[PDB]
Amino acid sequence: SDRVRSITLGNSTITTQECANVVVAYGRWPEYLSDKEATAEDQPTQPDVATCRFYTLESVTWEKDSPGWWWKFPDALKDMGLFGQNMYYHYLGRAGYTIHVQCNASKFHQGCLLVVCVPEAEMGCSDVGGTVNEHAISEGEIAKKFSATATNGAHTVQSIVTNAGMGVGVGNLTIYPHQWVNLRTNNSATIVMPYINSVPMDNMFRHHNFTLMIIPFVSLDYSSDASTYVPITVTVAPMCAEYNGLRLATSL
Amino acid sequence: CNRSCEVPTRLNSASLKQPYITQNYFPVGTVVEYECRPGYRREPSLSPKLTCLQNLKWSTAVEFCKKKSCPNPGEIRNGQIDVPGGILFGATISFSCNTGYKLFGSTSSFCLISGSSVQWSDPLPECREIYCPA
Amino acid sequence: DCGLPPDVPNAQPALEGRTSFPEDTVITYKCEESFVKIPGEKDSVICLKGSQWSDIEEFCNRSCEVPTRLNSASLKQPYITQNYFPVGTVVEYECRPGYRREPSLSPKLTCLQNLKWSTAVEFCKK
Amino acid sequence: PPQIDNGIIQGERDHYGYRQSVTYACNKGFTMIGEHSIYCTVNNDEGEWSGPPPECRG
């Protein structure tokens, strides 16, 4: 059957026995930068095992009324071993990603999650005259939570889930690389994002290349005596990662 | 009469240890030692000492005492925590509730020194749903 | 005279060696082991007219032990004077002399559901 | 087997022989600290429990 899928990067393996498929974002696989497309002149670093491997973020708890969570993903991996260190010591860095969202339940639970990878998901403030903080849009490995109602806070994001913090229709988020975790069908989704930008490399501190959103469209439901705890794990493996512009380390 | 550096400049992160804190004679080659002020803790890889150099100035300052940080502020159900400048010693955070919820409790909190450490001044408030009239 | 005071779950009354209590006697209950009294609640009964005790409701509940002593950090006020730590209680530490904060680490401990404090990290370093 | 404050023995039996076990359980609202069960050791023709029963703390 094609419901089984193994993904091996570096010293890390993920098996899944209820794979939907693999979404390769725009039909393009991560690739290293070529000479016809490069602009930075020094020789790049390509660790390629030390950095291109699965990293697991902190889980989130799917409750019966969760609006959803997001991560700004070039960020969010800055404590992940040598990937984080190479982000710290270089001015430019570049990587694609394998995102794997894991959420298992029983055959008696019902729920549907949309897992989207939104490039340049620039967000708006709750005060429509104000601007956001970095803490408002990202928290590293910690997930940023959407809201079920309009938020009122200066320097915070408008995180009511129906607008996705982006001023759009949430139901249109399927234009981006996405999968659905249907509990009656799935327990894992996986998207393979290449590097997407208007430049060949960028600073991995300054620019959030993409946001991973996990939004429950159909709420988490189960009848009593069943497990009330359903977690959601995200596993991210950088891919074809390279770095340029080595100097002393940034101190956030 | 002979030479010396000025009294070491005041640091927000660290204070001179005894006996240097009472001294005013610091000829070339004098090494003083600091200890962390409340709100800060030692960065062990860095030296907490300054040397009086030959040009009558103290050596370069490094962050041998770094800010003591408060715990994770956590989360408010149906509300939000505004953290505008970090959660280190002296920081401020503020609380609000989403549309349709009313805040009960403190509207802000500060990272202040608490005995041996730093702690949040006030606990997380609560966001209570509102009712329309009948 | 009233007879034996009412049974209270997870609490024991101080009878002081007698079994018949004159009117207006006030008997206090103390929570049993692994239980903490709930602030703002009655812990005592009184023998009313007609040889009848006043009603009392359960006033004891759960908590973690006093947080263990750390050489690197001490509990901040008001936690340092407290002994009631029900599940979900978060205390905060500050560095003892000789130590300074490791800013990337939290100086807070949470009382978990198994009545133990969360894992200790070196939030105060030498 | 010894009884414990704020806990019970689960289905206590009349007689416990070599390597037989006694399982403890704390009452509602009490937290178990220690071994969930203890068992009968036997040496020099004398029985003895493997160790102290657990604590049930409030």
Tab-separated table of C-alpha atoms in Angstrom, chain A residues 63 133 145 147 149-152 154-157 159, chain B residues 72 75 77 80-84 96-99 101:
chain	number	residue	atom	x	y	z
A	63	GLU	CA	-8.604	20.761	22.174
A	133	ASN	CA	6.667	42.948	17.521
A	145	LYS	CA	-1.946	30.550	18.654
A	147	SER	CA	-7.866	33.258	18.117
A	149	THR	CA	-12.409	36.171	18.066
A	150	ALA	CA	-10.874	39.473	17.076
A	151	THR	CA	-7.908	40.365	19.278
A	152	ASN	CA	-7.373	43.806	20.825
A	154	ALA	CA	-1.160	46.895	20.521
A	155	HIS	CA	1.964	45.322	19.003
A	156	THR	CA	0.163	41.982	18.701
A	157	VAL	CA	-1.188	40.196	15.667
A	159	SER	CA	-5.043	36.442	15.244
B	72	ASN	CA	7.858	32.294	30.568
B	75	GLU	CA	-0.778	32.239	28.067
B	77	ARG	CA	-7.190	31.776	27.592
B	80	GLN	CA	-3.235	37.910	24.893
B	81	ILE	CA	0.033	38.836	26.572
B	82	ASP	CA	1.876	41.826	25.098
B	83	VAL	CA	5.656	41.377	25.633
B	84	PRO	CA	7.182	44.473	23.973
B	96	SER	CA	-5.829	42.030	27.264
B	97	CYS	CA	-8.798	39.888	26.290
B	98	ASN	CA	-10.172	38.985	22.890
B	99	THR	CA	-13.408	40.472	21.581
B	101	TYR	CA	-14.233	38.701	26.889
